[PDB]
Ligand binder design. Structure first.
Ligand code: F8Z
Lengths: 272, 66
């Protein structure tokens, strides 16, 4: 139709590399004519094909076509040539949160509470659209122009009308108990991961970290969370309400947003 | 995509362009158009079962946004 557009590499001017990501590099770029600034992520097809994750790329693009949120990194569109798929992405001018954690070790309460509010808002929107994210962790988080968080990558995510799936997803330190047990799970896996993320942002390491894989599994399943002497009570409370073995006991997103510690410390800004 | 970094892509020029874009968001449908459905066969030049076999993942009840 009228809005079926032709997009190719010649529509873009490359500015600079932004870093290596999964299956390829990200570049700052702009549209030659409009000068609209984007991040162009260059995915190597052979790498995706070899790993057999074609279906994940499809999930990203389908989710991106149906969801938009100020704290979700927007995929404006995509195209491909013989060897590469190009994601035309929202540019995140303050870059990777995980680089800004290399700086400080941990984030202060204001920064953390802000991110937590933003993510609970973003995930409310995702869950309402029947999307479970399943990969909330610092390495997935970018920072907008005024530091507003952006969830980067939906590759581990899925649209699920029934909100019930079984695929094992995400990274070791963030696995909920029901995934380790190989059981069917719902959207409340995301609630668990918010808990883990809150801990890691404030402490600088995740709560079940261990030298070994099996020990991590053991600490996750037992919900062996021990809060360092540095952590304020409000954050210990919030995290304790999210990291519950039973999914149905986990603090709902609506209540994360209302949590006194979130309300006290969040300094969230929204773009126009 | 390995080029010398042009002046627009750094320092005050970049910041000021980012500021402009931040406060003057364009019509994104007009700029980028519809996100075309993925044809995995076409993209990877291969037929695999997963390319054709979908779960409920494929059944959207909410509208495409752009
Ligand atoms: C095969 O299936 C898929 C499925 C999904 C995707 N989508 C995808 O790759 N999206 C995406 C978008 C941004 C990303 C990444 C991934 C990525 O590859 N990350 C890694 C490190 C962990 O999976 C997440 C990071 C946040 C990564 C950061 N990059 C390297 C620098 C960067 C800097 C500034 C940016 C920017 C990206 O995009 C907007 O502005 O930014 C691709 C293939």
């Amino acid at each position: 139709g009228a809005n079926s557009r032709r997009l190719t590499v010649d529509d873009f001017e490359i500015g600079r590399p932004l870093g290596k990501g999964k299956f390829g590099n990200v570049y700052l770029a702009r549209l030659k004519e409009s000068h609209f600034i984007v991040a162009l992520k260059v995915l190597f097809k052979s790498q995706i094909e070899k790993e057999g994750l074609e279906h994940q790329l499809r999930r990203e693009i389908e989710i991106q076509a149906h969801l938009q949120h100020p704290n979700i990194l927007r995929l404006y569109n995509y195209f491909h040539d013989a060897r590469r798929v190009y994601l035309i992405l929202e540019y995140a001018p303050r870059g990777e949160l995980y680089k800004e954690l290399q700086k400080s070790d941990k984030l202060d309460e204001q920064r953390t509470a802000t991110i937590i509010e933003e993510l609970a808002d973003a995930l409310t929107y995702c869950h309402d659209k029947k999307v479970i994210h399943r990969d909330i962790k610092p390495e997935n988080l970018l920072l907008g122009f005024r530091g507003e968080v952006k969830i980067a990558d939906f590759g581990w995510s899925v649209h699920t009308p029934s909100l019930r799936r079984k695929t094992m997803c995400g990274t070791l330190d963030y696995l909920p108990p029901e995934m380790i047990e190989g059981r069917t799970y719902d959207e409340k896996v995301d609630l668990w991961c918010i808990g883990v993320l809150c801990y890691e942002l404030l402490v600088g390491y995740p709560p079940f970290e261990s030298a070994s894989h099996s020990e991590t599994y053991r600490r996750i399943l037992k919900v062996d969370v021990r809060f360092p002497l540095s952590m304020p009570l409000g954050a210990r409370d919030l995290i304790s309400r999210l990291l519950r073995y039973q999914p149905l006991e986990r603090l709902p997103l609506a209540q994360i947003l209302k949590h006194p510690w979130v309300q006290a410390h969040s300094r969230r800004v929204l773009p126009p | 995509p390995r080029k010398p970094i042009p002046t627009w892509a750094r320092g005050t020029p970049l910041s000021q362009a980012i500021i402009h874009q931040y406060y003057h968001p364009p019509n994104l449908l007009e700029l980028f158009g519809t996100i075309l459905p993925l044809d995995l066969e076409d993209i990877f030049k291969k037929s695999k079962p997963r390319y054709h076999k979908r779960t409920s993942s494929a059944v959207w009840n909410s509208p495409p946004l752009q």
